[PDB]
Amino acid sequence: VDMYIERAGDITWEKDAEVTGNSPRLDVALDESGDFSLVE
Amino acid sequence: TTDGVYRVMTRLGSTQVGVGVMQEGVFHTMWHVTKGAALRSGEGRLDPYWGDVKQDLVSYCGPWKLDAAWDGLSEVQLLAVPPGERAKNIQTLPGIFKTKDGDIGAVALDYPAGTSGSPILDKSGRVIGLYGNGVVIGSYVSAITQGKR
Numbered sequence: 001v002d003m004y005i006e007r008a009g010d011i012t013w014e015k016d017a018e019v020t021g022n023s024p025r026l027d028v029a030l031d032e033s034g035d036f037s038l039v040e
Numbered sequence: 041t042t043d044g045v046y047r048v049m050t051r052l053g054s055t056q057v058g059v060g061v062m063q064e065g066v067f068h069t070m071w072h073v074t075k076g077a078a079l080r081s082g083e084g085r086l087d088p089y090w091g092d093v094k095q096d097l098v099s100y101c102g103p104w105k106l107d108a109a110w111d112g113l114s115e116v117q118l119l120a121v122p123p124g125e126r127a128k129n130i131q132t133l134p135g136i137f138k139t140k141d142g143d144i145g146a147v148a149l150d151y152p153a154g155t156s157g158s159p160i161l162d163k164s165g166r167v168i169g170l171y172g173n174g175v176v177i178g179s180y181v182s183a184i185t186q187g188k189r
Contacts (some may be wrong), residue, residue: 003057005046006081009127012086013165017117017129023150024135028175034071034096034148036137036175036183 041081043063045121045159048073056123059157061167067100069157070172070185074098095174097187107189108166110134110145116169116184117161119145123154129161137175137183143182147171160184 027039041062048058048069060075067079072090076098079086091098099105110116118130134145145168147160156172169184 001050002080003048003050003074003077005048005060005067005086007042007062008047008059008088008121009045009164011043011045011063011119011159011161011167013117013161013163014129017131019115019131019166020149021130021132022135023133024146024177024181026135026137026146026175026181028137028139029130030094030139030141032094034094034173036173038177040173 042126045127046120047121048079048157056154058172059121059155061106061157061159061170064102065150066102066105067125068106068170068187069098070170071096071098072173073157095187096106096169096185099187104187105185106167106169106188107172108162109186110168110184112145114163116145116147116168118149118158119161120149120151120158120171121157121163122152132186135181146174146181148179148181149181155178
């Protein structure tokens, strides 16, 4: 199994981007395995 | 070696497992995308240089170079590179992961798994982190994961 990379674009801000998504505020914990979980 | 955003592919057919950022001669992606495997770039080979499972990050060819951070107020853009689709910009106001060690920006955007590693940009075009490590609230929310330079 070989893994390879292909260029897909410049890193640039686009003035005409689609805009979407919420901005939730969440209490979370980060464990040793890099996994985030919700906390109450 | 050119600066830019890249697909991370694997081989029957090919499948896109993730995305990463080339900057200053270093390739940046999420650990869970490559598990630290060497990467082919044309006839060249990219070897892992630094990685950390808890941060879910890895750099190739040199140390992590990305250091911009979300300002906590402004909208940002996910430069999403989904499998089979042209790179595209999605603008959003991040929410926040509140943790015992401080706050992390988070984006409530749910793109295919092969988009993991896609950069999140501030208004100046600087990469403030990578997309693809997060939590489910049933919508997925990704941390804005940034490394240390």
